Design a protein around this ligand. Structure first.
Ligand SMILES: Nc1nc2c(ncn2[C@@H]2O[C@H](COP(=O)(O)OP(=O)(O)NP(=O)(O)O)[C@@H](O)[C@H]2O)c(=O)[nH]1
Ligand SMILES: [Mg+2]
Length: 160
């Protein structure tokens, strides 16, 4: 037997959800932006506590019922250069809780490589994560920076 975990990745359009999943599961950086059509399924096998676990990442455009059904962990994503995507974070957390209840969740500020054009103050983001009682990562899918740690953390939080 091998444990599988269904993970959803949610957040406003263009924050980098598909890119994060394609980086994590296939090791590529998708530079072109196309809004995701339908639901896409990707997976990666990782070892947590020396046991192989299969992460099943569900990707859709930022359907509702089937997408969230059986979700076991969640990545909440906003973008360093998209203020509206940050201001919607609380609303996304309420939406996941309403649909699947209390599951392991992590908060991610993506595109941290564009920090020269940031519209989110470091204290603002860290405060939001504290209020929502969520661990917080700053990632760059483009630079493969902290992407692996986001998903390993969720897998450890689910298995423990
Ligand atoms: N500079 C930079 N661009 C990024 C990063 N991650 C993703 N992008 C870019 O952001 C754009 C949108 O990314 P995408 O993964 O499609 O976003 P999405 O959240 O899946 N959008 P949708 O909800 O419409 O499907 C793409 O041009 C992609 O290359 C990052 O870390 N840095
Ligand atoms: Mg997408």
């Amino acid at each position: 037997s091998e444990v599988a975990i269904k993970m959803v990745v949610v957040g406003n359009g263009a924050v980098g959800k598909s890119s994060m999943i394609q980086r994590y599961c296939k090791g590529i950086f998708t530079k072109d932006y196309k809004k995701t059509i339908g639901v896409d399924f990707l997976e990666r096998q990782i070892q947590v506590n020396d046991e192989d676990v299969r992460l099943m990442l569900w990707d859709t455009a930022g359907i509702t019922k089937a997408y969230y059904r059986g979700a076991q962990a969640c990545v909440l994503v906003f973008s360093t250069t998209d203020r509206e995507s940050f201001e919607a974070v609380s609303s996304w957390r309420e939406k996941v809780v309403a649909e699947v209840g209390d599951i392991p969740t992590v908060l991610v500020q993506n595109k941290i490589d564009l920090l020269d054009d940031s519209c989110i103050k470091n204290e603002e983001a860290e405060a939001l994560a504290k209020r929502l009682k969520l661990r917080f990562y700053r990632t760059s899918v483009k630079e493969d920076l902290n992407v692996n740690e986001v998903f390993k953390y969720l897998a450890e939080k689910y298995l423990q």
